[PDB]
Structures are given as structure tokens and as C-alpha cells.
Amino acid sequence: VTCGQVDANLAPCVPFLTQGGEPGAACCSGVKTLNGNAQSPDDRKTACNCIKAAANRYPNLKDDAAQSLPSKCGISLNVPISRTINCDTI
Numbered sequence: 202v203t204c205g206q207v208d209a210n211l212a213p214c215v216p217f218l219t220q221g222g223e224p225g226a227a228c229c230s231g232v233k234t235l236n237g238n239a240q241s242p243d244d245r246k247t248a249c250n251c252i253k254a255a256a257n258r259y260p261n262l263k264d265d266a267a268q269s270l271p272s273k274c275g276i277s278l279n280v281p282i283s284r285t286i287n288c289d290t291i
């Protein structure tokens with residue numbers, strides 16, 4: 202819904218998103234929280250663009266790092282996590 206919740210839930214992933222390894226229970230909990238509260242197509246689009254905004258705030262990260270997040274947390278997302286993602290394909 203709002204990008205503040207996106208950032209708050211993704212905060213515990215910055216250690217994983219900068220240092221790799223296995224994401225802790227906090228980061229996985231945040232990813233699942235974000236996924237659960239983005240239900241309608243407009244919800245998922247808003248969240249996708251909040252994610253792009255955060256990615257531009259952290260523009261020195263690797264996108265292949267964040268793509269391993271859903272598989273390592275359980276979820277199968279509907280978009281590639283890449284800084285170039287066209288969120289309109291949702």
C-alpha cells in the first residue's frame with residue numbers, strides 16, 4: 202500500500218542484500234509480510250514500484266542477490282526482482 206511499509210519490512214534484508222549468505226528469520230518474515238499485504242493488482246504494482254524506489258536508494262547492490270530472496274524464503278514471486286523491472290507487466 203505505502204512505501205513506508207515496504208521499506209520497514211525490507212529493512213532486515215539489507216544485511217542479506219549487501220553481504221549474501223542466508224537471510225535471517227527477520228528478512229524472510231519481512232518478505233512474506235510484504236507479499237501477504239499486496240493482494241490486488243494495484244497493490245502489487247504499488248509495492249513493485251516501492252521496491253524499485255528502494256533499489257534506486259541502494260543502487261550499488263546486485264540484483265541477482267535479491268532474486269535469490271523468494272526461493273530462500275519460500276515464496277514464488279510474480280516478478281523478477283531487478284532494478285529495471287517494468288512494474289506495468291503485472
Ligand SMILES: CCCCCCCCCCCCCC(=O)O
Nearest residue numbers: 208211212255256262263264267
Ligand atoms: C537490488 C534491486 C532489488 C531491490 C532489493 C530490495 C530493495 C533494496 C533494499 C532496501 C530496503 C529498504 C531498507 C531501508 O531503507 O531501511
